[PDB]
Design a protein around this ligand. Structure first.
Ligand SMILES: *[C@@H]1O[C@H](CO)[C@@H](O)[C@H](O)[C@H]1NC(C)=O
Ligand SMILES: *[C@@H]1O[C@H](CO)[C@@H](O)[C@H](O)[C@H]1NC(C)=O
Ligand SMILES: *[C@@H]1O[C@H](CO)[C@@H](O)[C@H](O)[C@H]1NC(C)=O
Ligand SMILES: *[C@@H]1O[C@H](CO)[C@@H](O)[C@H](O)[C@H]1NC(C)=O
Lengths: 447, 217, 220, 469
């Protein structure tokens, strides 16, 4: 039923970014009044984004995420560059960010006033990503139970902040910056918390049967998310000063330290567990892209393979993990959120541009959902707006990111398009492959 | 820092006359809050220390004659001497005191003009003690003349000498406003031995003919 | 009285440090800050910095920062400027000066300057040679007498005649530098009655090598 | 593609790959426990946060005194219900405090007709007082009431039978605490016999009620020793005084008046103020008013201003009005007795608009002193930064560090800060962010090179700079 559909999508969208990003939107919007407007604006942008993905998630329907659409709309090089961006930028950086929020919140009660030491925050971030990589390698039968449980902690911590906010009001604004530059970084910080809908929204179609009911699940759910995000920010702003919320890397622990008295055993624990759940989830669900990307021939054959006694996709996890662990070389959490956001929205731009170019090029291709053109023609321009400002508001992050993208062209030619014929090269590739197979004990999946 | 241009660099003027130095600052030295201008003037006579004349543009220091009047505001400042005396030849520097570290002008050399006068010329044979050294120095003094421009010919048995001749002028004398000049010729002992008659002759704009002095060893 | 005094002369081998010193008298030494100002020849006065005797705080122009170093000794009312890394273009006269108000920079009281010469050439005491007119000397009513000072170093040599008694009618000509040794001459004029009848001496004096000499001007 | 399951199940020869894969699996857990031990070492040897002091409300920013309700308003509106109107201004000043100059029923020099409990009806009714006081609570302005008995007279404690006067007060404090006031000011304590003992009794009465109430004493004194004696027996008394008043009138003494007093009291809490009652402009010449507001907002302690300090009001500028109680200039109407004498720039309305104005400086500083943990209760280190400069750093354990540089002398500096002998914990940076200057024509927000900085005469600067481990 539709009511139980909404309870699947809202619990998918809410994420862990809500525990990072309040400080982010407030730093760029200057004062609470405009921060709440940015939270709403991010909601509305997500409603327009989600319904466009309701279309692509039912017209093309090929499994594996955006890459599966790029094979139809572009093929060849742009399909590989989506996979390359998503495995070296997007899925690493969003794991590191949630692994680092985990680390700061787990540590913050040992450092109540003074900022938690970065050299320790980064080790504890890495200890989390490695431990959860090991658990996903040892047992899908265990790592599923670790995902089933901590989805409760995500909503328990976030509801507790709101009910504490209500009793604060029961007992009981200007927008001081308005530069278009900063407000795009406020939007990046606020949009990060909604960042589930492009990966997984189509899952609800396997239990909500009519195609017109999938838009109803979107249009009901994303206002519910927006409500929760606005209410949690009101819970902070009715308890904490702007000059407190910009000082603390873990703002909900400040709020928890004010109200609870038992503070150490509540907000740090329940929010920590939500992020331990969100890092686990991003590892568990990663395999799908490697299987698809190697089946469709873009990605090296070893990264398809599985350890046959445990049925866990060991070389894909170990690659995912080591990419996440390199983001420990980055400076600051909101640096990485800006970086993630640029390439995330630039990928969504290529997808929704693609959808309109496809509606032009192949009309009436049996679409179960067909949205009004008036939505994408605003939304594409909104993606372009964020990117176009960010080129000059945050140049250096885009520079190193485009350096990653351009470093994809060599491995596209060498690995896929040029198909370099020398037998010594092929025997070298094979030798390297079987070394890994023997050294991890891994085998191909059933074709 | 502030920079203080000063002009003219030289100001030759006659006794009794009024004279003006200009000082010109690369920022204003009016303190808005207080309505006074931070500047001072120092006189530095030849061979002595700077003496302070006026400060805060106009305030005479104690022990300063009342012929020094300072005036101006903003950036155009002027020290004026109402009636120059012979004792007044010096360099004068302006200084700002609107910031520390302070900075100074490159200074105006006041010079005196007087009625022209011909040099007293005298020549001195080498000192009998100096002849022990293997060298000898012949010296010609030109005393109490005006103006500064002069030249000297050395003659040695009638031959004109232009190697190893040196000159030094005094600064202008504050009692009488005259210059004086020393001229020196240095010889080996055997170079002083081989020639008999030594002549110093001086041409100065007060006479068509040179003035002459000489000796025979 | 307020009176600052300083050593007359210093010689410095290039690159070496030097201490120039200024002893105050005539006022409460801690009440007023002490400034150091310099006078490069033909290039205008330049201020180094100042020091507060009450706590040895000191404040320096940007050009001297780290190159100079002021200290002070409250037990003797003495202020000391160390200078360091001296080049030939740091040859100058260095003047010690006192403020009127407590630290504000205008300078009513200055010490007589310390002449700092930066040169590898060695200290060289002066050779003094008297000058007397010779032939036809007494044929004129006034007679000139002289004192050549030759081959000396460094720059500051002083001449006075008859221990400063003949302070009237003396001309001493600026020194000329030759082969890294100075030459200077001094002259005086007296009545023709005086010179053969009385003592006449150039009292030559040299601060930087302590020699004092009184050559008598004897006829040929 | 690659080597298949059916091959690999026999290529795993135990002496090679099986022993190797055991070794790497142990090396991973050994290495991850190494990284766990590494992180636990860092968290053990990292420096722990200094605990926050528990701060009474009057630590958190400026008090503000209203010696005559009438003079603050203009006549007719000169009553407590009038004052209830004005608190949005006070909230704009960010003043954590108020002090209502005495409102009790005093008859001049009459000990018997004077009462400290019944209010003088000119100012309203207790029903007005409570209406105000509840509004002030609502707006986060605590209110102190001034109980100095004979306030319409010459001698504020009367000439006679002082123990009866002290008895009046002893009763009064209890009543007004029950009414809900946040504390009491008393003045002229040099005119009170056995002063220290009465302050000790009244302080006991007040703190014995609740820990978050204060007694602000005040004296006409400017003697450091007399002041230290009143503050010897009483240790959480704010004692306003004339001590900073005798400033040398081009600031010259202030570095020394301030750092002797801090040293003498042993860096306890203080209340900086140029007087127990009169305006800043009663003592300062007007070039220093900006420079002192930069300093009074940034020394350790609770600053106290009289009304209109925030606009540089001056009793002399509009002649005839008393130096006790000058009429506050809200807008050009406010002194109608000589119309046209008030210029726009002299008035609250006329300043509120202008970022250069005195009140735009007050408002700005009042923010910093009430938000920033470093100004709120940091340490204080003066140092010799320059010839005129009184210069000092406010800091707290790892938060933002604030360097203040006040150029009291009338001569600008042209050669930077040149700090001798900073404490090794508090060293100056190469550059620091100008948060504000007392003067226009500065690049506020920008970093400055401290070794090549240039102060104008009387330019004070507030620089902000980040920590170093
Ligand atoms: C005053 O209060 C203190 C506690 O703060 C207490 O020790 C003392 O006995 C009290 N004295 C009186 C007379 O109330
Ligand atoms: C302070 O009060 C005393 C005692 O009445 C008096 O002698 C003194 O002059 C007063 N001083 C000031 C500055 O009011
Ligand atoms: C005042 O400061 C000096 C600073 O060296 C210190 O020695 C002294 O003990 C302090 N206290 C008193 C009461 O002088
Ligand atoms: C305010 O403006 C008047 C009129 O232009 C001017 O004379 C005065 O200096 C200004 N300042 C004050 C505080 O009066």
């Amino acid at each position: 039923t539709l009511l139980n559909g909404v309870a699947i999508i809202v619990g998918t969208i809410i994420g862990s970014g809500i525990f990072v990003t309040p400080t982010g939107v407030l730093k760029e919007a200057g004062s609470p009044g405009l921060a709440l407007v940015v939270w709403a604006a991010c909601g509305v942008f997500s409603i327009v984004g989600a319904l466009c993905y309701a279309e692509l998630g039912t017209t093309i329907s090929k499994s594996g995420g955006d890459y599966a659409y790029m094979l139809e709309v572009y093929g060849s090089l742009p399909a590989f560059l989506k996979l390359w961006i998503e495995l070296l930028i997007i899925r690493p950086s969003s794991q590191y960010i949630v692994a680092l929020v985990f680390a700061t919140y787990l540590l913050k009660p040992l450092f109540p006033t003074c900022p938690v030491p970065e050299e320790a925050a980064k080790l504890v971030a890495c200890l989390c990503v490695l431990l959860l990589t090991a658990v996903n390698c040892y047992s899908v039968k265990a790592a599923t139970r670790v995902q089933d449980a901590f989805a409760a902690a995500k909503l328990l911590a976030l509801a507790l902040i709101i009910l504490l906010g209500f009793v604060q009001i029961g007992k009981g604004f200007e927008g001081t910056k308005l530069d278009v530059g900063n407000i795009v970084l406020a939007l990046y910080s606020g949009l990060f918390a909604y960042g589930g809908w492009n990966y997984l929204n189509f899952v609800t179609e396997e239990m909500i049967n009519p195609y017109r009911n999938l838009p109803l699940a979107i249009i009901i759910s994303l206002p519910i998310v927006t409500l929760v995000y606005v209410l949690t920010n009101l819970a902070y702003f009715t308890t904490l000063s702007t000059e407190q919320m910009l000082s603390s890397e873990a703002v909900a622990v400040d709020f928890g330290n004010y109200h609870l008295g038992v503070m150490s055993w509540i907000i740090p624990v329940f929010v920590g567990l939500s992020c331990f759940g969100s890092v686990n989830g991003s590892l568990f669900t990663s395999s799908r892209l490697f299987f698809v990307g190697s089946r469709e021939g873009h990605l090296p054959s070893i990264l398809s393979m599985i350890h046959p006694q445990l049925l866990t996709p060991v070389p894909s996890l170990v690659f995912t993990c080591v990419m996440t662990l390199l983001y420990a070389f980055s400076k600051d959490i909101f640096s990485v959120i800006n970086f993630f956001s640029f390439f995330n929205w630039l990928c969504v731009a290529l997808a929704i541009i693609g959808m309109i170019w496809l509606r032009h090029r192949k009309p009436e291709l049996e679409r179960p959902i067909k949205v009004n053109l008036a939505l994408p023609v605003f939304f594409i321009l909104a993606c372009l707006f964020l990117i176009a400002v960010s080129f000059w508001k945050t140049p250096v992050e885009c520079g190193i990111g485009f350096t990653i993208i351009l470093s994809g062209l060599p491995v596209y030619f060498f690995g896929v398009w040029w198909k370099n014929k020398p037998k010594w090269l092929l025997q070298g590739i094979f030798s390297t492959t079987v070394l890994c197979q023997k050294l991890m004990q891994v085998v191909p999946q059933e074709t | 820092d502030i920079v203080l241009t000063q002009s003219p660099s030289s100001l030759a003027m006659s006794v009794g006359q009024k004279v003006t130095m200009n000082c010109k600052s690369s920022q204003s030295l009016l303190n808005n809050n207080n309505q006074k201008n931070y500047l001072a003037w120092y006189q530095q006579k030849p061979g002595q220390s700077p003496k302070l004349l006026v400060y805060f543009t106009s305030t005479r220091e104690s022990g300063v004659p009342d012929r020094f009047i300072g005036s101006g505001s903003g950036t155009d400042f002027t020290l004026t001497i109402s009636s120059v005396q012979a004792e007044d030849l010096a360099l004068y520097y302006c200084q700002q005191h609107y910031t520390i570290p302070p900075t100074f002008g490159g200074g105006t050399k006041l010079e005196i003009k007087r009625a022209d006068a011909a040099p007293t010329v005298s020549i001195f044979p080498p000192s009998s003690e100096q002849l022990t050294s293997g060298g000898a120095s012949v010296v010609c003094f030109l005393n109490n003349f005006y103006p500064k421009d002069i030249n000297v010919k050395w003659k040695i048995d009638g031959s004109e000498r232009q190697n190893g001749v040196l000159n030094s002028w005094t600064d202008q004398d504050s009692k009488d406003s005259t210059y004086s000049m020393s001229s020196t010729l240095t010889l080996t002992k055997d170079e002083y031995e081989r020639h008999n008659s030594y002549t110093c002759e001086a041409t100065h704009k007060t006479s068509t003919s040179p003035i002459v002095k000489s000796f025979n060893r | 009285e307020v009176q600052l005094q300083q050593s007359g002369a210093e010689l410095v081998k290039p690159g070496a440090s030097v201490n120039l010193s200024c002893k105050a008298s005539g006022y409460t030494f801690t009440n007023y800050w002490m400034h150091w100002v310099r006078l490069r020849p033909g290039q205008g006065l330049e201020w180094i910095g100042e020091i507060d005797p009450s706590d040895s705080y000191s404040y320096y122009s940007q050009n001297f920062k780290g190159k100079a170093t002021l200290t002070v000794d409250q037990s003797s009312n003495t202020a000391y400027l160390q200078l360091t890394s001296l080049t030939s273009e740091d040859s100058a006269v260095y003047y010690c000066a006192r403020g009127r108000q407590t630290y504000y920079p205008w300078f009513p009281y200055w010490g007589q300057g310390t002449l700092v010469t930066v040169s590898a050439a060695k200290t060289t005491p002066p050779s003094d040679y008297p000058l007397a007119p010779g032939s036809a000397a007494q044929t004129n009513s006034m007679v000139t007498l002289g004192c050549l000072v030759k081959g000396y170093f460094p720059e500051p040599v002083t001449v006075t005649w008859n221990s400063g008694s003949l302070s009237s009618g003396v001309h001493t000509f600026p020194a000329v530098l030759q082969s890294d040794l100075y030459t200077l001459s001094s002259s005086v004029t007296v009545p023709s009655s005086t010179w053969p009848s009385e003592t006449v001496t150039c009292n030559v004096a040299h601060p930087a090598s302590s020699t004092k000499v009184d050559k008598k001007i004897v006829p040929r | 593609t690659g080597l298949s399951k059916e091959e690999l199940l026999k290529v795993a020869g135990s002496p090679g790959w099986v022993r190797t894969r055991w070794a790497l699996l142990l090396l991973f857990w050994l290495g991850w426990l190494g990284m766990l031990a590494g992180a636990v070492v860092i968290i053990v040897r990292a420096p722990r946060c200094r605990e926050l002091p528990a701060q009474k409300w009057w630590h958190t920013g400026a008090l503000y005194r209203i010696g005559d309700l009438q003079a603050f308003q203009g006549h007719g509106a000169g009553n407590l219900a009038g004052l209830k109107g004005r608190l949005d201004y006070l909230s704009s000043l960010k003043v954590k405090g108020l002090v209502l100059g005495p409102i009790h029923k005093n008859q001049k020099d009459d000990v018997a007709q004077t009462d400290l409990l019944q209010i003088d009806p000119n100012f309203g009714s207790k029903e007005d007082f409570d209406s105000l006081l509840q509004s002030a609570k609502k707006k986060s302005i605590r209110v102190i009431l001034d109980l100095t008995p004979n306030y319409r007279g010459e001698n504020s404690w009367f000439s006679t039978q002082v123990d009866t006067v002290a008895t009046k007060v002893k009763d009064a404090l209890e009543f007004w605490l029950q009414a809900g006031v946040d504390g009491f000011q008393v003045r002229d304590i040099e005119n009170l016999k056995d002063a220290s003992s009465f302050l000790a009794e009244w302080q006991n009465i007040t703190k014995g009620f609740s820990e978050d109430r204060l007694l602000i004493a005040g004296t006409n004194s400017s003697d450091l020793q007399q002041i230290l004696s009143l503050l010897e027996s009483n240790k959480d008394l704010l004692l306003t005084s004339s001590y900073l008043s005798d400033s040398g009138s081009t600031g010259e003494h202030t570095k020394s008046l301030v750092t002797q007093y801090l040293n003498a009291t042993g860096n306890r809490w203080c209340s900086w103020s140029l007087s127990q009652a009169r305006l800043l402009t009663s003592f300062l010449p007007a070039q220093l008013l900006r420079l002192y507001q930069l300093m009074l907002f940034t020394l350790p302690g609770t600053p106290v201003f009289s009304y209109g300090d925030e606009i540089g009001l001056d009793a002399a500028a509009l002649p005839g009005q008393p130096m006790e109680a000058p009429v506050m200039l809200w807008d050009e109407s406010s002194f109608p007795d000589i119309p046209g004498a008030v210029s726009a720039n002299m008035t609250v309305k006329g300043q509120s608009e202008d970022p250069g104005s005195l009140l735009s400086l007050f408002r700005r500083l009042s923010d910093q002193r009430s938000k920033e943990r470093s100004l709120l209760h940091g340490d204080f280190h003066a140092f010799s930064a320059g010839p005129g400069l009184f210069s000092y750093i406010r800091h707290w354990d790892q938060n933002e560090r604030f360097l203040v540089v006040l150029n009291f002398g009338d001569v600008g500096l042209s050669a930077g800060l040149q700090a001798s002998d900073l404490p090794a914990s508090a060293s100056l940076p190469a550059k620091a962010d100008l948060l504000l200057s007392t003067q226009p024509g500065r690049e506020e927000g920008s970093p400055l090179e401290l070794e090549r900085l240039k102060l104008e005469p009387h330019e004070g600067l507030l620089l902000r700079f980040p920590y170093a481990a």
